[PDB]
Write a protein that binds this ligand. Structure first.
Ligand code: NA
Lengths: 74, 75, 124, 74
């Protein structure tokens, strides 16, 4: 697993290859994105992007606002 | 998550048994303790602590008293 | 083998066998190199953390070392409650050590004396 | 080996299980450089340099922007 916080969002990755953004205020889901594989590291946030490294050996960047995948490498 | 974190004279530490403890750094006197279950990670940010367990249940607590602000478990 | 550290243009690196070293960050030249064995390995595991003219490193033999940044000599060495597998954390003149058997200890930076011990596991 | 990415100066660093290190442009995901050298286990970044340590406790200093080896010591 892994949890991080930035910009009014709590980000969490899951083994189910899901990444969640909850609102820091009330825990309500802001967004939810299926990623390329098992998200087994803390998400890392920088410049409006949420970086996800998967067991699959993929590296994806998700938009902080809506969770859309900006890019996927490897 | 076994490395202790320190913010503003207060130490936050997680035991394997899901016990989360806030201590005064100087004396070691316990400010608060919460008995949780299977907590895998936590982070301190501003006025809150955010936790998650193996069931992807996410909680927020006050940094002051470890009082539950909200709980999300339908993930 | 352990997590390296950087302070004032010096790279501090250690391995499990007990080798600790300090390198000039510009050209990699060895400022000092020292062994915390013994022959019998020291089993360094927690560290490296740099602060207050000291390099702090914990081991599997339940020891916490403070080495001088100047020359790598042992400033102090403290028996802790269990294996020191985490990185030491330094704050307000104290070195915090979370032992593998659930104890949290705060040790003085100056002399390594355990100032306090808390059992994190304890039902409460 | 820590798999979680590190971001410095708009550059993403990711270490794979096999000790392969990749440096990517944060905004585009564009690969800047890759080193499939040794069994690197750990690194730390400062201003313009990244310091890698291997299984044998060898230390290499590389530039962040170009992945240029400035020195090695063993
Ligand atoms: Na916050």
């Amino acid at each position: 697993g892994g949890v991080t916080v930035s910009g009014g969002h709590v980000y969490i990755g899951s083994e189910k290859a899901q990444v969640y953004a909850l609102n820091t205020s009330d825990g309500t889901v802001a967004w939810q994105t299926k990623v390329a594989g098992e998200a087994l590291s803390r998400p890392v946030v920088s410049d409006g992007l949420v970086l996800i490294h998967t067991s699959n050996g993929q590296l994806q960047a998700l938009n902080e606002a809506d969770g859309a995948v900006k890019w996927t490498v490897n | 998550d076994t490395t202790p974190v320190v913010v503003n004279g207060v130490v936050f530490a997680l035991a394997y048994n899901g016990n989360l403890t806030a201590l005064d750094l100087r004396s070691g006197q316990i400010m608060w303790k919460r008995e949780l279950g299977s907590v895998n990670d936590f982070i301190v940010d501003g006025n809150r602590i955010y936790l998650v367990d193996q069931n992807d249940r996410v909680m927020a607590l006050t940094i002051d008293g470890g009082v539950t602000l909200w709980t999300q478990s339908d993930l | 083998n352990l997590h390296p550290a950087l302070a004032d243009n010096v790279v501090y690196a250690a391995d499990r066998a007990g080798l600790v070293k300090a390198l000039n960050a510009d050209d990699g030249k060895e400022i000092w190199s020292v062994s915390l064995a013994e022959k019998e390995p020291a089993l360094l595991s927690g560290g490296v953390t740099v602060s207050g003219g000291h390099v702090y490193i914990g081991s599997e033999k339940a020891q916490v070392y403070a080495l001088n940044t100047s020359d790598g000599t042992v400033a102090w060495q403290t028996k802790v409650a269990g294996e020191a597998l985490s990185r030491p954390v330094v704050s307000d003149g104290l070195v915090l050590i979370h032992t593998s058997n659930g104890q949290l200890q705060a040790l003085n930076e100056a002399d390594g004396a355990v100032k306090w011990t808390v059992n994190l596991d304890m039902p409460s």
